Amino acid sequence: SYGPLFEALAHYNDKLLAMAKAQTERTAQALLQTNLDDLQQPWQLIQAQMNWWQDQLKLMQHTLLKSEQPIYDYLKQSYLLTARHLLASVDALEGVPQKSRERLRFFTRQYVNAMAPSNFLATNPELLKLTGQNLVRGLALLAEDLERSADQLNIRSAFELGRDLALTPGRVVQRTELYELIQYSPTTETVGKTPVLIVPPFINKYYIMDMRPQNSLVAWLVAQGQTVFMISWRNPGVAQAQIDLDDYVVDGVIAALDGVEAATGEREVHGIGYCIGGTALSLAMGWLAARRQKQRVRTATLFTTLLDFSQPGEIFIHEPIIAALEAQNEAKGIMDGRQLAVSFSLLRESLYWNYYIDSYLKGQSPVAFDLLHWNSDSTNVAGKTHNSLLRRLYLENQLVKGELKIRNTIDLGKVKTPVLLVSAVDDHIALWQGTWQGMKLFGGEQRFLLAESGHIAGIINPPAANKYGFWHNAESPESWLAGATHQGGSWWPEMMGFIQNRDEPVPARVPEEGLAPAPGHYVKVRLNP
Amino acid sequence: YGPLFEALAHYNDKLLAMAKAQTERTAQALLQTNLDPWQLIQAQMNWWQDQLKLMQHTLLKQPIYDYLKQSYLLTARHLLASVDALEGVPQKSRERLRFFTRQYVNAMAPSNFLATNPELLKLTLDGQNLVRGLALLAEDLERSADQLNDESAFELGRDLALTPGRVVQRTELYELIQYSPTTETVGKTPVLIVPPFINKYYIMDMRPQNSLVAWLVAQGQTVFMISWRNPGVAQAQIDLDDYVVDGVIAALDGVEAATGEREVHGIGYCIGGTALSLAMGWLAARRQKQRVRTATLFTTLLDFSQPGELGIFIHEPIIAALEAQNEAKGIMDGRQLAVSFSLLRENSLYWNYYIDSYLKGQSPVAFDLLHWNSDSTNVAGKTHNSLLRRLYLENQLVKGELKIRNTRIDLGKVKTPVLLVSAVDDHIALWQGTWQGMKLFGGEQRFLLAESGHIAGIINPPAANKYGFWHNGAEAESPESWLAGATHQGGSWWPEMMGFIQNRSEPVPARVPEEGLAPAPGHYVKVRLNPVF
Amino acid sequence: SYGPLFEALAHYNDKLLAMAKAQTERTAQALLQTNLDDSQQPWQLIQAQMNWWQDQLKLMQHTLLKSEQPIYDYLKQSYLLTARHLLASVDALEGVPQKSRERLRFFTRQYVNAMAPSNFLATNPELLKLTLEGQNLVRGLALLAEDLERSADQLNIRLAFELGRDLALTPGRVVQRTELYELIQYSPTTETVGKTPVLIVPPFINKYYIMDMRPQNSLVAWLVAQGQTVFMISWRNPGVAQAQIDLDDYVVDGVIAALDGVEAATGEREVHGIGYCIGGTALSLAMGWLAARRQKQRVRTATLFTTLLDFSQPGELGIFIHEPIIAALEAQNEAKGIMDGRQLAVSFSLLRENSLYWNYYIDSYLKGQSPVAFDLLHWNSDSTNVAGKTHNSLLRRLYLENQLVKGELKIRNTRIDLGKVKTPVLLVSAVDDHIALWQGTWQGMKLFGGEQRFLLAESGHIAGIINPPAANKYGFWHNGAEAESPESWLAGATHQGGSWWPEMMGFIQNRDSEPVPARVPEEGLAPAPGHYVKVRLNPVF
């Protein structure tokens, strides 16, 4: 039962040899084009790791076929394979500079710690067993030691935004206390009449959707003839400690819609939201509909959006813990992203295979390095916003019970905006079943899509990659999946088609000079300078 | 499971106890001072324990991939922890660790040696084609060693083989080393050590704590050591007969010239014991007065009925091809022999001679043993052919057909008391075979079985208190019958050997060696096949 | 005491008169070959120079027998001879196209500067004054070098032979290209060739085509015609990227890699080695390196032309061998990265034959050849860079410290002892050599532990080596016996006229191997001359 594994390794091994052959002719051809007045990872290092995989798999199959001393001998041979990997890895780094060598050790140490379940509190074994008021004190002691472990790693240099990441050309056309509104310059002669507005999450930074040109959702939307706007949430400081979740809905999202009208003259836009930005977009649509204002969101697309919190995945929802954090939130003013970083890990997809090995085989700068930089670029959370999200949504679940009020005002059944929900099969933060149960909350047209990966990989899958797939098409979440068909490739054309199917193109809108260039000033603020 | 975790806890607590003591050592240093990488071992211990826990967890419980993924993470954690432990380590020591680790890894690969190569077994499982398949395997194994072929080596006289002595005689085949005494009085009968000429002798003189030569000197015995020449093309016509007569007998005359004693105590190792046995048979067959009072033979093969894993080579087409190559090339290259078989195959090298050496505050003994094993020596062409055909193939010594310079050899004429010391886990000379050959002698016979492999069981100094041995004074019909009737005794067998020599006269004042020709280690031993600067 | 001078002049004058008759008939036949519908410099120009020589010698002899006013009169009459020479030279170029006028004016100016001792640092009198008694010398050397470089620079900016067409045109293929060299394998001209191929290791100070100039004096073409598979290493002209290359890399990554490349092309692990000025030194270090590591012998025979292994007498280069100069030079090489060949051009001249004008311009012209001196002058001015770390090693480890004789030299942590080399060597040196004094080369011959042969050519650094048998121009001294001193060897040696190339070929052939069918080189990577050699420091379009 190892055939597919040996085949998958042989496929990767053959692709690495082809890349080595390409490097061999490239360096040989380089000898011809030398002037005597001037002057990526080694494929040998990747080969060293591939050799470890196949030899360990061969050793395991060998020991199982042979079936106190048998356990030890396999352990000894496995240790020998570990030694061969270490020696080959060190020797492969002969010509690599020490600076690049230090960078390699950094990302590996970062990745190893991220994959360790004990190093994150939500998946730490001791507190899982605990599942009274004493636990809260123990939990704080665990966090301080876990925070120190991450801090000591950080204390003992990476990608710069605007140059290596988040480099899609655009302009900051509006800046408020809560956000910078980025309008992206077009790459087509004509674009659609209705512009697009993206509401990213305020849990981490927005550039997960604008990483590199090949996998930039924004750049892909621009190439499809669409005026793209992006909300860039502010990294909350002590001054924004008293801001509440409602303010993000009204003073953040609604104000951005008026800003889009001021920049384009359009009172209706196409909405796109992520995990909690989509939730804010959902609350904004219900707020606009409940007050019988003319509809301003033509379509709504929600990526991994939780509206029903009945299935919270991976534990803090118990009332005593929520109160203790709310008090701490008042004391500190904000929920520290460095403190929040040790609670759980947003990145748990195949990261090594599809975003380190495969991206390297495609001649790309390793995408997994970009994801680890993003994951460790944590952002604060407003104290009052954090409490509101904890009590009224995760704990009390006011939106499902119809008790949720936004500035003394929510029934999603009044929303007649067509929605498209995109969830992930391997999602650990937002269980897709919950998104399916939450899909029924809307009163208009509803469509659902399930990506064939985890929280991030299934969403950031550009068509060119053709790496994954998705299921398309009920009484239960399970009933939809059984009747759904698998479709390979990316689902981005399906979302783009959904927007275009409802409906004249306009000349490409060149954004005004605005206040600042594309990346802005809000996103560059780091917690660890 | 249980026993493995218990052994792991033993090493973890011993490392933690030794690490805590080192912490106290530096703390006390702060008080007692005038103006004028244990973490690396812990990194490896964590890998063993973490991989064992995962292995036990998965076995009790796509599933295959998860174990591979989790196993790969442990490898990555091991690399990071190992490299970080080597931050302050000097570059010289770091290179030494990289060098010896690569040696240990390649040595533990069964495919990397012809004698234990499965591919060669497949061919053995063919006629003239067998030679060609063997030649392609041999050239491939030989090529790999060159890529390995680096000044991480120990210099003789400085780190190893530093027992004080003098070279009192130099001939074409050997330098005779006489060691200076460390006692006021010594025994009347001197000691002569005949090491193997397959590898170098300093396995018996490594470091003062485990130096057999140094221990013999401290017991009040004048010790002589034959230092064989690393044979060149000029010595192509040297035969096994020459090693017996011009090597061992000539050394006996050299002992007489240096001490005035016509009888010495003989000690032989892997093939020196065979040469010492043939020398005693030669002197007895020609009715010369006995010149060897006692004989001690370590892992000595006189009956080649059980050749171990070397028996794969014992086939007429293979031997004939080697006889042609040895005659044409002149010598059997030690560089070719280094990939053929490994004299050093202890089942506990990593644990008992690397890990334990760190816990005993010693420089890792495994590094010294690997340096010795890779210090290959050539073999004379005609000598190799004689050893291949007349001993391994034809087995002339058992059948009485062996002739040493036109002198038929019968060991039954030897009336010298012999003591054979073998190793239970030996891969070169199976002890059963050594026991079968012990019956060939006509005088007093004693047998001892060491509780380890070819090297570890022999080089076990009393101070270590590491292993044990089996002794049985009565005679037995079979090796299995002897072991069943033998009694086990812990510790080293070296004190028992000294009693065998000593029980057989008032001691005389310590013999001071003459100034001689050269210092203690000599120059013959330093000749390497792959020179080092 | 002018008999020999007038005899040589009468001989040259009569040969020129005969060639003038040939040119007169040459143009007459051309008139016959006219189609109605549609080089060699004029003999009058050579006659103009010959007239100056004979008249100046006659005037000098006349004034010396007659021996203020006497000094001035000879000066005045000599000036008249100069004016008559100038008028005759210009008039001889009457119909000559402007291009040939430019080519002749260029090489003459090149020749004039080459013969001026002041124009070279090694033979400069002013720089010598500083040598006879620190930083004063360092700066003094820098101002002279910069000034000589400035003078050459203004000359260059105002500005012939294309490689593969006029020079280095022996057919072959580039079978391997690495960072340091292109391996040229030459296509055969014989039915059968020897089993053991030949590998030539040229110096990396200048370019290799001194050994492959024109078919008449091409050593490579002659070796090919004698039934030998010939390989040639073509060193890369070192750039800024190769600043960290050391002498060890040329020895190991250059020569040893070439041996593996020759084996890859032919399947032969043993070749005949041939080395020149510093390639022979690199070839010597390669044999010592292989023997010190007890690798199977890969060089069957070794022939070394003007090779320095003992640097006790560096000749006229000894003026530079001083710690303050070497320390200052090591700083420049580390900072600049490389030793600029244009700077090296003003330091010393590899081409300093006394009889260059007579034997390679006048005599070569009378043989109906394009003047060989023009080809030699293009070669000498085709300077190449030197790697910074490589130059430092050559200055300190070889010229200054002399580590190879003292046994202290290490090549990649490998001590080198040439006594371990058992390869039969043949050293060929030049009696008039100014770069590698033959005495020094003889002292270095004793370093080898195998068979040794020595040959002394009857000319300078270049003329004595590039002497093809067809020319029959010079001679050489041979002595089979071993001698205690260079003078003892020379006293016991026998002189033989002609070229020494057959002796080396006999030396190579006697040590052997039934001949094999001629090895046709694979299509390879590039045509014969390669791309590395065409790289010039002063580019030409």
Spatial CB neighbours of A169, under 8 Å, sequence gap ≥ 6? A184, A185, A518
CB B280 within 8 A of CB B414: yes
What is the rounded distance in angstroms from the CA atom of residue A76 to the CA atom of residue A69? 10
Name the token pair of B391: 């001993």
- H helices then E strands: how many in chain C? 20, 15
Question: Which residue intervals of A291-411 are DSSP H helices?
Answer: 319-332, 337-341, 351-352, 358-361, 367-375, 383-388
Contact B149, B499 (CB under 8 A): no
> Using alpha carbons only, what angle is made at residue B484 by residues B482 and B489, rounded to the nearest 5 degrees?
90
Which residues in chain C are contacts of A34 at CB distance < 8 A? Answer: 236, 239, 241
Chain C residues in contact with B150 by the CB 8 A cut-off are 413
Q: Which of B72, B74, B80 sits opposite A105 (nearest CB)?
A: B80
Please choose, from the candidates C312, C331, C353, the residue with its C-alpha nearest in 3D space to the C-alpha of residue C461: C353
Selecting from B3, B83, B108 the residue whose C-beta is nearest the C-beta of A80 gives: B108
Cα–Cα distance between C464 and C432 in angstroms, integer? 8
Could you give phi then psi for residue B268, rounded to 5 degrees? -130, 150
Note the maximum CA span of chain C: 78
Q: What is the DSSP letter of A367?
A: H
User: Would you call B351 an interface residue with chain A, using a CB distance cutoff of 8 Å?
Assistant: no
* Measured distance CA(C359)–CA(C353) in Å, rounded: 9
b/e string for C382-405 if b means 16 or more Cβ within 10 A?
bbbbbbbbbbbbbbbbbbbebbbb
Question: Are B68 and A78 within 8 A, CB to CB?
Answer: no
Please choose, from the candidates A347, A274, A283, the residue with its C-alpha nearest in 3D space to the C-alpha of residue A305.
A274
Tell me which chain C residues have a C-beta less than 8 angstroms from the C-beta of B531.
292-294
Dihedrals phi, psi of C201, to nearest 5 degrees: -110, 95
Alpha carbon distance B227, B527 (integer Å):
11
Q: Spell out the residues 6+ positions from residue A459 whose beta carbon is closer than 8 angstroms to its own.
A: A274, A303, A304, A422, A424, A451
User: Are A36 and C238 a contacting pair at CB < 8 A?
Assistant: yes
The B residues from 62 to 121 touching A (CB cutoff 8 Å) are 64-65, 67-69, 71-80, 82-83, 98, 101-102, 104-105, 108-109
Shortest CB distance from C292 goes to which of B149, B529, B531?
B531
From C241's Cα to the closest Cα of chain B, the distance in A is: 28
How far is the C-alpha of B461 from the C-alpha of B467, rounded, in Å?
10
Which two three-digit tokens encode residue A229?
């706007």
In eight-state DSSP terms, residue B517 is S
Site of tokens 């890998």: B47
Give CA–CA dist A46/C415, Å, rounded: 36
Q: Give kind and range of the element (H or E) at residue A7.
A: helix A3-30
Nearest Cα to Cα of residue B470 among B453, B447, B444: B447
Confirm if B341 and B428 have CB atoms less than 8 A apart: yes
Q: If contacts are CB pairs under 8 Å, which of residues 120-159 in chain B contact chain A?
A: none
Provide the H-helix boundaries in C468-537.
486-491, 501-511
Inter-chain residue contact B531 with C413, CB threshold 8 Å? no
Q: A116 to chain B nearest CA, in Å?
A: 9
Q: List B166's β-bridge partners, or say none.
A: B178
Active-site position among A114, A219, A275, A420? A275
* SS3 at position C519: coil
> What are the residues whose beta carbons fall under 8 Å from the beta carbon of C453, sequence distance 6 or more?
C424, C425, C426, C427, C480, C507
Cβ contacts of A296 within 8 Å, gap of 6 or more: A257, A267, A268, A269, A288
Residue C385 to residue A36, Cβ atoms within 8 A = yes
Chain C residues 268-287 with CB within 8 Å of chain A: none
Answer whether A147's CB lies under 8 Å from A338's CB.
yes
Chains adjacent to C (≥3 CB pairs closer than 8 angstroms): A, B
Identity of the residue in A31, A32, A36 whose CB atom sits nearest the CB atom of C240: A36
* C-alpha to C-alpha distance for A399 and A392, rounded to whole angstroms: 8
Residue C208 DSSP code:
G
Separation in Å, CA of A496 to nearest CA in chain C: 50
Record: contact B151-C413, CB cut-off 8 A: yes
Interface contact flag, C293 B530, Cβ < 8 Å: yes
| B104 in Cβ contact with B112 (< 8 Å) | no
How many CB atoms sit inside 10 A of residue A360's CB? Answer: 21
In terms of C-beta density within 10 A (0-12 exposed, 13-18 middle, 19 or more buried), how is residue B510 classed?
Answer: middle
- DSSP assignment of B60-83: H--HHHHHHHHHHHHHHHHHHHHH
Mutation pick from C176, C179, C336 vs chain A, by most beta carbons of A within 10 Å, is C179
Name every chain A residue with its beta carbon within 8 A of the beta carbon of B65: 5
SS3 for C477? Answer: strand
Taking a C-beta distance cutoff of 8 angstroms, is the pair C410, C288 a contact?
no
Strand, coil or helix: what is C234? Answer: strand
Closest CA relative to residue A400, chosen from A307, A311, A312, A305: A307
For this structure, is C277 an active site residue? yes
Select from C248, C260, C294 the residue whose CB has the most chain B CBs within 10 Å, as the one to mutate to test that interface: C294
Kindly list the residues from chain A whose CB atom is less than 8 angstroms away from the CB atom of residue B83.
Answer: 90, 105
Question: Is the minimum CB–CB distance between B533 and chain C shorter than 8 Å?
Answer: yes
Please answer yes or no on whether B530 and C294 come within 8 Å at the CB atom: yes
Q: Are C461 and C435 in contact (CB under 8 A)?
A: yes
Counting one residue from chain B and one from chain C, the pairs whose CB atoms sit within 8 A come to 13
Dihedral sign of CA atoms A218, A220, A221, A222 in order: positive
Q: Looking at the complex, report in whole angstroms how far the Cα of residue A468 sits from the nearest Cα belonging to chain B.
A: 18
Asked if A35 and C179 come within 8 Å (Cβ–Cβ), the reply is no
| Edge-to-edge order in the sheet of strand A196-199 | A485-488, A469-472, A446-451, A419-424, A297-303, A269-273, A196-199, A228-233, A179-184, A170-175, A516-517
C292 contact B CB<8A = yes
∠ CA A258-A193-A440 to the nearest 5 degrees?
Answer: 70
Closest by CA position to A344, among listed A505, A143, A91: A143
Query: For chain A, how many residues are written?
Result: 529
> Which chains form contacts with chain A, at 3 or more CB pairs under 8 Å?
B, C
What are the angstrom distances between the C-alpha of B256 and each of B213, B218, B272, B273?
20, 22, 20, 21
> Distance (Å, rounded) from C-alpha B254 to C-alpha B261?
10
Contacts of A78 in chain B (CB under 8 A): 51, 71
Element at A175 (helix H, strand E): strand A170-175
Which experiment gave this structure? X-ray
Q: Comparing C-alpha atoms, which of B50, B44, B55 is closest to residue B79?
A: B44
Mutate to test the interface with C, among B142, B377, B533 (most CBs of C within 10 A): B533
Resolution of this model in Å is 3.3
What distance lies between CA A337 and its chain's CA centroid?
A: 16
According to DSSP, the β-strands at B165-170 and B468-471 are unpaired
Count CB pairs under 8 A between chains A and B.
76
Q: How far is the alpha carbon of B94 from chain C, nearest alpha carbon, in Å?
A: 18
B-chain residues near C293 (CB < 8 A): 149, 530-531
Please check whether residue B531 touches C, CB under 8 A.
Answer: yes
Catalytic residue among B131, B156, B240, B270: B270
Nearest to B420 by CA among B404, B397, B436: B436
Does residue B529 belong to the interface with chain C, where contact is any CB pair within 8 Å?
A: yes
* Rounded Cα gap, residues A198 and A211, in angstroms: 15
Residues sharing a CB contact under 8 Å with residue C338, sequence separation 6 or more, in sequence order: A36, C238, C239, C240, C242, C243, C385, C386, C387, C388
C243 vs C337: CA distance, rounded Å: 5
DSSP symbol at A517: E
Q: Which residues of C touch B139 (CB under 8 A)?
A: none
String of DSSP letters for A257-281: HHHHHHHH--S-EEEEE-TTHHHHH
What does each C-alpha distance from C25 to A11, B45, C2 come to in angstroms?
Answer: 78, 99, 35
Write down the H helix ranges in B201-244: 212-218, 240-242
Options C48, C121, C277, C394, the catalytic residue: C277
Contacts of C294 in chain B (CB under 8 A): 529-531
Sign of CA dihedral C69, C70, C71, C74: positive
How many whole angstroms separate alpha carbon A123 and alpha carbon A131? 12
Contact between A515 and A172 under an 8 Å Cβ cutoff? The reply is yes
Backbone dihedral angles phi then psi of residue B222, each to the nearest 5 degrees: -70, 120
Question: What does C355-405 look like in DSSP terms, one character per residue?
Answer: THHIIIIIHHHHTTSPPHHHHHHHHHTS---EEHHHHHIIIIIIIIS-HHH
Gap between the Cα atoms of C458 and C528, Å rounded:
32
**Per-position DSSP letters for A483-509, written without gaps between them:** H-EEEES-SHHHHHHHHHHT---EE--
Buried b (16+ CB within 10 A) or exposed e, C278-313: bbbbbbbbbbbbbbbeeeeebbbbbbbbbbbbbbee
Q: Which chain B residues are closer than 8 Å to A64 by Cβ? A: none
What separation in angstroms does the CA of C88 have from each of A119, A328, C18? Answer: 98, 108, 20
Of A120, A97, B92, A148, nearest to A105 by C-alpha is A97
Measured CA distances, C361 to B324, B505, C55, C95 (Å): 63, 99, 20, 22
